[PDB]
Design a protein around this nucleic acid. Structure first.
Ligand SMILES: Cc1cn([C@H]2C[C@H](O)[C@@H](COP(=O)(O)NP(=O)(O)OP(=O)(O)O)O2)c(=O)[nH]c1=O
Ligand SMILES: [Mg+2]
Length: 340
DNA sequence: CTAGGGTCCTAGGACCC
DNA sequence: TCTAGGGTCCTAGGACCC
């Protein structure tokens, strides 16, 4: 009975760079760390996507695929300001807004009577207003539940939208690959595949008890989504639970002196961020993370009442001594868990 | 050749009745 | 606690999203 819109900015980071500097519009560009910083692609424009460049791709791999790729470091304040403006635009239509990141959000427009209650037309006018006021484009999905609205906002990217009507949900589900369902990633998909389950169609012919056994709470979400069942309400009141800061070295470190020097560079950053939402720096836990050169990672965290540099250093020394094992370390991170 | 923000779930032992 | 076991907290790790 509800109407959910999922709105999604196209090539968001890249799109802001291209607006601000038009000479980037028709050449392949990407935001991400450089190859020597051991970077990863955050996102790429469509001329770069043509070459196979994707989010989360190692920058070294992107550059082999697209040698003339232009790498930008990214400008958070620019993306943030675009994001605020966009969210303020959503607020013109409803207060039922659940942001999932800078670039996107769910809207529950069930009880709105903008555009004669048309969720299709509301989505259209939001995309138009965003183009008008920010010169960036958005795609949208309109559906009776969250996850279908989110899948839908991809159907007609870029700068388009897609509507899934209650009567259309069954045909839509029947051939929908499980991997397109939010929270079904590569490991899940492959495990499902090895059971003969590829599509929501397949999952409908499956015993619930049995999915509960092999997958726990995940198996129930699976069975529900496959039916088109998604009762999760649009929640406009979510609050951040943690604050973390980490860096990957251009080169693996092998000595503790190097590790402590990195922590001293991280700590002020963790403190400035935490203070932004907790001026008194009071927290529930603090902890450290190490990532080794074989990519295993370990965290050590404990109840602690107030952000403290020396105890983070101390904690990192124990973690360093105990679980490094002569391995090179590629990443150091600090972490706090916020009070409830 | 593998980022940096995060969220949510699982699970053994401690701890408390 | 009335006794074999139930509930909740602490911690580490993993899958996942953007
Ligand atoms: C998936 C992803 C996104 N991001 C950043 C860059 C994207 O511009 C932004 C929004 O994420 P998205 O909506 O997943 N991707 P997009 O907006 O670039 O592309 P699309 O047009 O939505 O397909 O978040 C990363 O920094 N690393 C990532 O792995
Ligand atoms: Mg997007």
């Amino acid at each position: 009975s509800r109407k959910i819109i999922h709105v999604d900015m196209d090539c968001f980071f890249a799109a802001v760079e291209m607006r601000d500097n038009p000479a980037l519009r028709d050449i392949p560009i990407a935001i991400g760390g450089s190859r020597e910083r051991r970077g990863v692609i955050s996102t790429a424009n469509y001329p770069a996507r043509k070459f196979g460049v994707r989010s989360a791709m190692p920058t070294g791999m992107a550059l082999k695929l697209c040698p003339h790729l232009t790498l930008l470091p990214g400008r958070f304040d620019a993306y943030k300001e675009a994001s605020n403006h966009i969210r303020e635009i959503f607020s013109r239509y409803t207060s039922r807004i659940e942001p999932l990141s800078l670039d996107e959000a769910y809207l529950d427009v069930t009880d709105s009577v903008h555009c004669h209650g048309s969720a299709t037309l509301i989505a259209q006018e939001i995309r138009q207003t965003i183009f008008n006021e920010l010169q960036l484009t958005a795609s949208a999905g309109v559906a009776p539940v969250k996850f279908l609205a989110k899948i839908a906002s991809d159907m007609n990217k870029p700068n388009g939208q897609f509507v899934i009507t209650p009567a259309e949900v069954p045909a839509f589900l029947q051939t929908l690959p499980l991997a397109k369902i939010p929270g079904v990633g590569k490991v899940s998909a492959a495990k499902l595949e090895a059971m003969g389950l590829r599509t929501c169609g397949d999952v409908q012919k499956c015993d619930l008890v049995m999915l509960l056994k092999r997958f726990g709470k995940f198996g129930r979400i699976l069975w529900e989504r496959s039916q088109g069942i998604d009762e999760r309400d649009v929640n406009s009141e979510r609050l951040r639970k943690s604050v973390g800061v980490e860096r990957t070295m251009a080169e693996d470190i092998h000595h503790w002196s190097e590790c402590e020097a990195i922590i001293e560079r991280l700590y002020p950053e963790l403190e400035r961020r935490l203070a932004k939402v907790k001026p008194d720096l009071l927290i529930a836990r603090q902890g450290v993370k190490l990532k080794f050169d074989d990519f295993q990672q370990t965290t050590q965290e404990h109840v602690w009442p107030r952000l403290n540099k020396a105890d983070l250093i101390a904690t990192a020394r124990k973690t360093w001594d105990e679980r490094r094992g002569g391995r090179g370390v590629r990443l150091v991170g600090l972490h706090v868990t916020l009070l409830d």
